[PDB]
Design a protein around this ligand. Sequence first.
Ligand SMILES: */C(C)=C/C(=O)C(=O)O
Ligand SMILES: */C(C)=C/C(=O)C(=O)O
Ligand SMILES: */C(C)=C/C(=O)C(=O)O
Ligand SMILES: */C(C)=C/C(=O)C(=O)O
Ligand SMILES: */C(C)=C/C(=O)C(=O)O
Ligand SMILES: */C(C)=C/C(=O)C(=O)O
Lengths: 62, 62, 62, 62, 62, 62
Amino acid sequence: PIAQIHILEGRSDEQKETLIREVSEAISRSLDAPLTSVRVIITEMAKGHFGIGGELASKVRR
Amino acid sequence: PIAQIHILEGRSDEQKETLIREVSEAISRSLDAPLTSVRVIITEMAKGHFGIGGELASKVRR
Amino acid sequence: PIAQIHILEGRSDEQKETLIREVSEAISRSLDAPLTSVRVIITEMAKGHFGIGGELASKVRR
Amino acid sequence: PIAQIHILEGRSDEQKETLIREVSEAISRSLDAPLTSVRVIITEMAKGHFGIGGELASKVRR
Amino acid sequence: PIAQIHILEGRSDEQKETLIREVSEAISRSLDAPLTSVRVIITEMAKGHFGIGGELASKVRR
Amino acid sequence: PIAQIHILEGRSDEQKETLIREVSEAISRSLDAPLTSVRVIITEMAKGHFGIGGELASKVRR
Ligand SMILES: */C(C)=C/C(=O)C(=O)O
Ligand SMILES: */C(C)=C/C(=O)C(=O)O
Ligand SMILES: */C(C)=C/C(=O)C(=O)O
Ligand SMILES: */C(C)=C/C(=O)C(=O)O
Ligand SMILES: */C(C)=C/C(=O)C(=O)O
Ligand SMILES: */C(C)=C/C(=O)C(=O)O
């Protein structure tokens, strides 16, 4: 399984590391797949490249 | 956060349901984000549409 | 420019056709790009393959 | 609905903002979905990371 | 490396098989990476889900 | 056809150029499509944004 996760910029490397570890275990337990076959890609979005309801995330999020 | 997960076809709806629930919480706890902002997309691949090392998964996986 | 749009299953072919036409023009006008260079991909998700807040869309949307 | 748009680097923040706003309204009108549920991700590509017909966009585009 | 390839529906399984094999080797030779670490995902688009220049591919391609 | 390739950061521009050229020809020969219609997007991943088996690629790859 491959997971690509888009998140707004801002998190710490520690949080991203945890994210990768947690999501990998979640996928592994859920599908009963070896943890070693799980790949996770984190794609960070700049506040000016994400829109919700038509507005920029920078005008509406931290 | 938005997560797209590519998995091989075959799992039950129960397993996918669990996948969606488990990955959502993992993301939520990890980034300390409200569980309600987390979206998860499961994309299923046909065994003849996934290749590892140049070989089809149908030739090399269950 | 290339746009991939993930939407829940259910729309008519007419609506999707309109989606493709309307998003293409929006991109074209917005970036001042020739309408002919714009590609649009519509990816439909099964209600059991999309989750919002940990819950399936089939349990939480029409 | 979620839209991911890949575009070559170069546009202004104003153009990207418009893109996000225009595409969101286009998706909303087309599908008759609340504008507030539409998310748009803009992924910018470096001229050296996009190829058309085998050539780099930097050799063949502004 | 992971490659996702979007192609119009219609090809035979033989052609897709070749696609997967040929792109895997191309990536392997190009990046000087072990062929065994290369994953390829083929995503097929329905003619009514792909638009070029605002028009559906079913209206404009075989 | 459109190809998006995720690779770890580190390659040279020459290698990426080759990758784009090789993959484009591979897709073109395989599908018997005009080379001019093939688009290739290279998305580079930071060693800290890719996980394999739950670990960061930075702890386990060059
Ligand atoms: C998930 C994409 C698993 C995989 O690729 C493998 O089985 O090696
Ligand atoms: C993750 C994509 C979160 C989000 O969209 C939000 O904060 O509403
Ligand atoms: C958007 C992806 C435009 C493009 O590919 C072109 O300029 O041909
Ligand atoms: C489009 C992806 C809409 C959506 O997620 C929602 O209904 O909240
Ligand atoms: C490409 C995504 C290669 C990879 O995952 C690996 O080195 O195992
Ligand atoms: C592959 C996506 C080919 C294409 O878009 C075209 O036929 O112009």
